[PDB]
Amino acid sequence: RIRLGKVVPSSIRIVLDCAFDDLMNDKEINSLCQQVTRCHSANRTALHPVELFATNFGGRLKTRQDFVLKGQQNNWKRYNPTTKSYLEEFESQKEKLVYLSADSDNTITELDEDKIYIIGAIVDKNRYKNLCQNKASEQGIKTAKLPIDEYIKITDRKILTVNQVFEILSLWLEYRDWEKAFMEVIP
């Protein structure tokens, strides 16, 4: 791709919620692990890089990572992995958390610089009905989906990966146009 303009970092924080390794087999972990790297690489070159968080980061996911990258991950900026839940890291900013979920009745129309956007670090999330709605709802936090229904077939929407959702958000900061952003990532 070709990026127009000067790189200005963003205040926004984006959290990969990695507490779902109960759910996946090894192959799915291996695949999640690659999508995590991919989020970081798209962040590395964004026009407006965020602070990327990996919460509840551990277990088979951390293992697969160190296995594949052999330590390069520790050199990643602006990248904050932590065993703590996003609920802990952001104890003082709970009302600033937004859990993204295709099942929300809310829709993002813009991202705010003061907010914290969560992506469930889960593969084939389609086997799990309302999985991320249930979780955030139970926590008292707001959920929202991306405003992309006019651009994606409902059966493809459910198939969007963790880096795809990240890339859409990152690319939105650059173009401030949800359709330019979406099209850049999908076709």
Q: This structure's resolution (angstroms)?
A: 2.5
DSSP state of 97: E
Domain boundaries of the chain, sorted by first residue: 1-187
Question: Which residues does the annotation place in the binding site?
Answer: 100, 120, 124-128, 132, 146, 158-160
Instruction: Please state which CATH number belongs to domain 1-187.
Output: 3.40.1280.30
In the chain, residues preceding a discontinuity (C to N beyond 2.5 A) are: none
Phi, psi dihedrals of residue 103, rounded to the nearest 5°: -95, -5
- CA angle (162, 166, 171) in 5-degree steps: 145
Catalytic, out of 124, 149, 156, 177: 124
Contact of 114 with 96, CB cutoff 8 Å:
yes
d(CA 80, CA 55): 8
d(CA 26, CA 40): 21
Q: Which long-range contacts (CB under 8 A, 24 or more apart) does 82-85 make?
A: 82/53, 82/54, 82/55, 82/57, 83/56, 83/57, 83/58, 84/55, 84/56, 85/19, 85/55, 85/56
124 among known catalytic residues: yes
Contact of 58 with 18, CB cutoff 8 Å:
yes
Contact of 13 with 51, CB cutoff 8 Å:
yes
Question: Which residues does the annotation place in the binding site for S-adenosyl-L-methionine?
Answer: 100, 120, 124-128, 132, 146, 158-160
In this structure, what token pair is assigned to residue 180? 């330019």
d(CA 123, CA 69): 20
Provide the sign of the torsion angle of the four alpha carbons 169, 132, 104, 15, taken in this order. Answer: negative
